Amino acid sequence: AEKEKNAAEIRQQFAMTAGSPIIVNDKLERYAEVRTAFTHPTSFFKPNYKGEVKPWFLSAYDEKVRQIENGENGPKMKAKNVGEARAGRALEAAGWTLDINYGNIYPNRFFMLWSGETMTNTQLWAPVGLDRRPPDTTDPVELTNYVKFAARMAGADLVGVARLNRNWVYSEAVTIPADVPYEQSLHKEIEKPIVFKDVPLPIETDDELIIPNTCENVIVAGIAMNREMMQTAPNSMACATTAFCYSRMCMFDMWLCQFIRYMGYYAIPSCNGVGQSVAFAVEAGLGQASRMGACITPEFGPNVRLTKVFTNMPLVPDKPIDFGVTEFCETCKKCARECPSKAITEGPRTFEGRSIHNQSGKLQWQNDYNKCLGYWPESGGYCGVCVAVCPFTKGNIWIHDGVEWLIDNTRFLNITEVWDGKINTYGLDADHFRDTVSFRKDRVK
Amino acid sequence: AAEIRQQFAMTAGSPIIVNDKLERYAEVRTAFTHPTSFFKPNYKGEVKPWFLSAYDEKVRQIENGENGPKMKAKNVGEARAGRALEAAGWTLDINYGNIYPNRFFMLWSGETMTNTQLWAPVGLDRRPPDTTDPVELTNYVKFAARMAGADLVGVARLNRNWVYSEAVTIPADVPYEQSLHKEIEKPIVFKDVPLPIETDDELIIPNTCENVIVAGIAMNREMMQTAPNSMACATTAFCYSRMCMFDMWLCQFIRYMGYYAIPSCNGVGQSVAFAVEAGLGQASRMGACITPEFGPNVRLTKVFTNMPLVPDKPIDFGVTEFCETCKKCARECPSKAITEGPRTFEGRSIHNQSGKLQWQNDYNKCLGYWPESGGYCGVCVAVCPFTKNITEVWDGKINTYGLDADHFRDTVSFRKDRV
Ligand code: SF4
Ligand code: SF4
Ligand code: SF4
Ligand code: SF4
């Protein structure tokens, strides 16, 4: 008889002994955030469909407008009518409501404050003094249970803990001067060193973003995207589920930082800023690195967004997980063949970055992320075709052979219907929502 | 669950019975804001703003390793944790309810929002609507509402009877830190204007604001059943921040579709009346809207719009007849706030709106218990049949946003359920 699928069982079976799984050599150096394709001068500019060179997001805007006017939901993809095309872009735009400039990357700005002190919620609650009272719990085991319970309340579908590996913290962040208003932010970005010092609290000076040496841990969250919407990639509904999850990420960070602060510790939010989420997620045991470059998880595959919070709160690190992703990616290459920009390599892993956008010195499949970003204005969205076609993204990949769990190798061999089809709260799926149920035994051993 | 709802659907028309005495209700009259009820003693006998007195009780409980009134926690650490979680939950809510219209998160226009500014070149909020068909709009906006975190969504024509006559708000340029000390009253009026607008004197809603979208935001059953203790305060708090994010997300979508939208959370008008008219559930003895999916263990928010929409049918699954014989909430209420008597048209005090047929409760008695217990009680929600220790909650079942996978299928939605 059918074995009732068991996500907890699966994670126990594939857990590895302690130790960062990421393989590195001597040329590894911390990576300046300005080097990402979003921000580096070599890649930030892309032509629009008339050949005008603009900031990538403005050229993408040009394509969204063109598609709506032409009744399309994506590149060469006819919508049912202009009304439908319009609605997909309205939904996508609305999704970004709680996110600054596509990612909340500027640290200690807007939603990403490194201290709770000026927040309206903090001020309201000040007479209770939760943020001033010394911790009443120092036991990492109890703390892990508490903070994970809180994280699920805060919208995480997956959560894990790792020691903070500084190799993945940006050497310098992209940010804006403190006196610069939002409307000028995009034309006033600067770089600022992220450094570690013997100081009691996270603090920013004119010169540096300073993280205390006591910042021992990172808490990593997975925010699940919607399967039906993502599978319309690269068209508008895939952009919408991407967008809503960035706002969910932001809520998570603030909710969790406030909980941690009110427990008597400090907390640094980050969303897409501060450090590399995939590395943290892999070290925290959410999943494994993959050919496309994302963290693939047992529950959602790569179809999940990541955010992370850094803290001095004592915690128990989770174990990394190995469920055979690396061996599947070696033989699969489906994302590489389907990629509209041919950004993803079909070759072996190496320690040498393909270009400035990759961090050399860690063993990974090296993808050309300038080619990736280039397809975004062309398609008028955030693509996501690699996520959509990855077999791990499919809802039913796991089978049980009577003794243990394993991946089904067979799995590796329209937008109107989505608008008219199944949906549920936050785009989560009741047919799989049991997979992320959590009891104490799931949060700490 | 969709089965259940179509079985008990009634014909069109508001199920709320009213007489010729009914007048719109000034927000300041609520127990939260009225001068007769705003101040309560703390446990030392000091008179303070109700919430400040409630703070003193929370501090006192933490120090004494308690999760609620005379409810011992496993240890001080646990007590601390419950209050830290409760406090964090309110992160995206202003002053316990986001009631000031057109302030902070509750902006009546999207124009100054960072998201709107980033997206300005696409022109979605300036482009005339490409869809005016109410059937397609109802389907789009409900899909959007579920994306935005609603567990239930319904549409009704806007009954102005339930819109506050005057809102509680603050002057536009007053900073957050002075807000509580500078609350004022401001008329909400309807006029022939193209867009929602605020003047020095008035909050102006266009006469074209035809509809109200009501959302239900499900609270966590395990935590609410700890009422009046701290974990019941925590699920309350987290769902207020979910309300806020819903309003902002949905207003933005509606604006980007070419219409206008007014967010509200606990402000602008009375959520329970709207929810009943939009068919989410029925009014109850305790005063809440009881839903088939969640009973009363669900929060409400709403958005007002000129977007053409198909109103939902009100529902009647026997709540009124059940509440007539039950009286369990009234027996359990720690403050005896809830009447055991028949429904009347006459309010028990200033906090009630007279002229509508309802169970009349004494809500100053209810607020009175909040400083005493150091939380937001909720005992009535917890004991209500329609809804069905703290260490076991912290060690027990949880899932994303405190939703329950055993019941999450009940809120699945296809087009046929939307329009
Ligand atoms: S598509 Fe195949 S090769 Fe690409 S990340 Fe998924 S499993 Fe790996
Ligand atoms: S997002 Fe698109 S263009 Fe970029 S790597 Fe994935 S499939 Fe290729
Ligand atoms: S919240 Fe508590 S005090 Fe108020 S009415 Fe309900 S049971 Fe009574
Ligand atoms: S406890 Fe009983 S009387 Fe009170 S609202 Fe629930 S069903 Fe009605």
What does the model show?
The structure is a homodimer. The first copy, chain A, has 445 residues and is of the alpha+beta class. Chain A has one domain (1-445). Chain A contains 15 helices and 16 strands. In chain A, helix 4 packs parallel to helix 8. Bound molecules: iron/sulfur cluster (4 copies). Residues 339-341, 343-344, 372, 375, 383-386 of chain A line the site of one iron/sulfur cluster. It is classed as oxidoreductase. Keywords: oxidoreductase. The assembly is dimeric. The entry is titled "Crystal structure of the PCE reductive dehalogenase from S. multivorans in complex with iodide".
Distance between the termini of chain A: 30 Å
Tell me what portion of residues of chain A adopts beta-strand conformation.
5-15%
What fraction, in percent, of the residue positions of chain A are helical? 25-40%
Strand arrangement across the biggest beta sheet of chain A: 5-10-14-11
- The gyration radius over C-alpha positions of chain A equals 21 Å
- Bound ligands, named by name, code or SMILES: iron/sulfur cluster
Number of contiguous helices of chain A: 15
Note the quaternary state here: homodimer
How many strands appear in the DSSP assignment of chain A? 16
The helix-and-strand class of chain A reads alpha+beta
Q: What's the story with the biggest beta sheet of chain A?
A: 4 strands, antiparallel
**Most residues in contact: chain pair:** A-B, 86 and 82 residues
Domain module count of chain A: 1
Described by the principal axes of the CA atoms, the overall outline of chain A is: globular
